[PDB]
Design a binder for this molecule. Structure first.
Ligand SMILES: CC(C)C[C@H](NP(=O)(O)O[C@@H]1O[C@@H](C)[C@H](O)[C@@H](O)[C@H]1O)C(=O)N[C@@H](Cc1c[nH]c2ccccc12)C(=O)O
Ligand SMILES: [Ca+2]
Ligand SMILES: [Ca+2]
Ligand SMILES: [Ca+2]
Ligand code: NA
Ligand SMILES: [Zn+2]
Length: 304
C-alpha cells in the first residue's frame, strides 16, 4: 500500500505499508525480507508492536522517519554498493521507535535498530536524521563484514565507518546528527567530520584519547578517522600535509571496500591506513592520484 505522513522535521513523505484487514501496518514487504517498524510504547521491550494506522496517513513522526530512512538506506546500499540489506542476503530491517522515556540514545543491538525519543532538550527523536538511521544500520553491515570489536581503536573505526556512510547517504554537509541535536540552537551538531575538535573529538592521532570511558573512547577517537575521510574526499592541508581531494563518490567506494573487505575484528588505525590504501589501489591503480591521496590523508592525521 502507499502510506504517507510527516517526519520528525514536519516534512511529508511517502513509503510502503501493508493493508491488514481494516487498517495498515508499517511494514514494507518489497525490500529484501522486509522493512518493518515498531513502537516500544515508551517502555524498553523490543521489538515492541508493529505500528498501525487506520487510514494509511500516519501521525508518528519518529516511526515515519525510522521506516522511510530504513527503506532509503536499503536502496542506497543496493544502488551504491550492490549489497542486499545488512547481511548481503536481504535480512529483514527492523526498527523500533519510542524506546523508553525521554531516552537520549539510539543503537544497533545485533538484530535491529532502536531509537529513543530524546529528552526534547539535547535531542529530539533520533530517527529524524537520515545520517543517524544510516549510522545505526551501518553497525549491522559492520557486524556482518569486518566485525570490528567495540573497544579502543577498533571500536573507533566501527563508529567512524557508521559516520562516513550515514553522512554520505544524505550528503547535506559534513555533520552527523545535526537534524536531531539541540533543537534550540541552529547550525550545531553531534559531530563534525570536517572539523571534529568543534565537538571535543580529536582530529589528529597525537591527541588520541587513551582513557577508559566509552569503551576506550570509541565515540571520541572516531574523529581521527572522520577527519581522514573528509581530507580524502574534500582535500586540504592539515599538519603540513596536503591531500588532493578525490570527491565523495570515489572516497566512499574506497572506504566501503576497505572496511568491508580488508579490515578484521581486531584492526587498529594502522590497519585501516593499509586497507584504505589497498582499496584505493584496487579501484584506481597502485600509483594513481587516488592511492596517493589515500596515503596522504593518513599521513595528515598522524596515522602512520
Ligand atoms: C548517531 C548518534 C545519534 C547515536 C550513536 N549511537 P551508537 O554509536 O549507535 O550506539 C551507542 O554506542 C555503541 C558503541 C554501543 O554499542 C551502543 O549500545 C550505544 O551505546 C552515537 O554516536 N552515540 C554516542 C553519542 C551520544 C548519543 N547520546 C548521547 C547522550 C550524551 C552523550 C553522548 C551521546 C554515544 O552513545 O556516546
Ligand atoms: Ca491515520
Ligand atoms: Ca544530518
Ligand atoms: Ca541544534
Ligand atoms: Na545482540
Ligand atoms: Zn555508533
Amino acid at each position: 500500500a502507499t502510506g504517507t505522513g510527516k517526519g520528525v522535521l514536519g516534512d511529508t513523505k511517502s513509503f510502503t505499508t501493508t493493508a491488514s484487514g481494516s487498517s495498515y501496518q508499517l511494514k514494507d514487504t518489497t525490500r529484501g525480507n522486509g522493512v518493518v517498524t515498531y513502537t516500544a510504547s515508551n517502555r524498553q521491550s523490543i521489538p515492541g508492536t508493529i505500528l498501525t494506522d487506520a487510514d494509511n496517513v500516519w501521525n508518528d513522526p519518529a516511526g515515519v522517519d525510522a521506516h522511510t530512512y530504513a527503506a532509503k538506506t536499503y536502496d542506497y546500499y543496493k544502488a551504491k554498493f550492490g549489497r542486499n540489506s545488512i547481511d548481503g542476503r536481504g535480512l529483514q530491517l527492523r526498527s523500533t521507535v519510542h524506546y523508553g522515556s525521554r531516552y537520549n540514545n539510539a543503537f544497533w543491538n545485533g538484530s535491529q535498530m532502536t531509537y529513543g525519543d530524546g529528552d526534547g532538550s539535547t535531542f529530539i527523536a533520533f530517527s529524524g536524521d537520515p545520517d543517524v538511521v544510516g549510522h545505526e544500520l551501518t553497525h549491522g553491515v559492520t557486524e556482518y563484514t569486518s566485525n570490528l570489536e567495540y573497544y579502543g581503536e577498533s571500536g573507533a573505526l566501527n563508529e567512524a565507518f557508521s559516520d562516513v556512510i550515514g553522512n554520505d547517504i544524505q550528503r547535506k554537509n559534513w555533520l552527523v546528527g545535526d537534524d536531531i541535536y539541540t533543537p534550540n540552537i541552529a547550525g550545531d551538531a553531534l559531530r563534525s567530520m570536517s572539523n571534529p575538535t568543534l565537538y571535543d573529538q580529536p582530529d589528529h592521532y597525537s591527541n588520541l584519547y587513551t582513557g577508559s570511558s566509552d569503551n576506550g573512547g570509541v565515540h571520541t577517537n572516531s574523529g581521527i578517522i572522520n577527519k581522514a575521510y573528509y581530507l580524502l574526499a574534500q582535500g586540504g592541508t592539515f599538519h603540513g600535509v596536503t591531500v588532493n581531494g578525490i570527491g565523495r563518490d570515489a572516497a566512499v567506494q574506497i572506504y566501503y571496500s576497505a572496511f568491508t573487505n580488508y579490515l578484521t575484528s581486531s584492526s587498529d588505525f594502522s590497519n585501516a591506513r593499509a586497507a584504505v590504501i589497498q582499496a584505493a589501489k584496487d579501484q584506481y591503480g597502485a600509483n594513481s592520484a587516488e592511492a596517493t591521496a589515500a596515503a596522504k590523508s593518513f599521513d595528515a592525521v598522524g596515522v602512520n
